[PDB]
Amino acid sequence: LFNDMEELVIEQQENVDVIDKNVEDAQLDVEQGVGHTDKAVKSAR
C-alpha cells in the first residue's frame, strides 16, 4: 500500500509543479492586462 501511495504521490508532484507555474504565469499576465486597461482608461478620459 505504501508503494502504491508513494508512487502515485510521485505522479502528483508534476501536477503540483505545473499548477504552481500555470497559475503564476496567469497572475502576471492578468496583472499586465489590468495595467493595460488602466492606461487605456487614462487615455479615453
Partner 1 sequence: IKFTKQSSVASTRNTLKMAQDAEAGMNTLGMLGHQSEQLNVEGNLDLMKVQNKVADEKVAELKKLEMELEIDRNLDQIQQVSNRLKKMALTTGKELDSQQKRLNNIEESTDDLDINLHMNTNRLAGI
Partner 2 sequence: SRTAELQAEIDDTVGIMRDNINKVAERGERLTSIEDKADNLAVSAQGFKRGANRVRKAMW
Partner 3 sequence: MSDPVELLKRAEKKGVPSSGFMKLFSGSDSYKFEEAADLCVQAATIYRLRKELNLAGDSFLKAADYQKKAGNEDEAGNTYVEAYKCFKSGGNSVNAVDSLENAIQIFTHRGQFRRGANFKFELGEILENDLHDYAKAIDCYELAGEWYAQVALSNKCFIKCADLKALDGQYIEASDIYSKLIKSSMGQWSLKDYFLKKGLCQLAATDAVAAARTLQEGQSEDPNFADSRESNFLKSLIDAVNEGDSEQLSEHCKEFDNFMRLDKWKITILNKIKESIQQQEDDLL
Told to check if 7 binds partner 3 by CB under 8 A, we report yes
Told to check if 10 binds partner 2 by CB under 8 A, we report no
Cell of 30: 492578468
Question: Virtual CA dihedral for 34, 37, 39, 41, nearest 10 degrees?
Answer: -140
Least separation in angstroms between CB 7 and partner 2: 10
Q: Scanning the structure block, which residue is given the C-alpha cell 501511495?
A: 5
Report the Cα 15 to chain-centroid distance in Å.
12
Q: Which residues bind partner 1 (CB under 8 A)?
A: 2-3, 5-6, 9, 12-13, 16-17, 19-20, 23-24, 26-27, 30-31, 33-34, 37-38, 40-41, 44-45
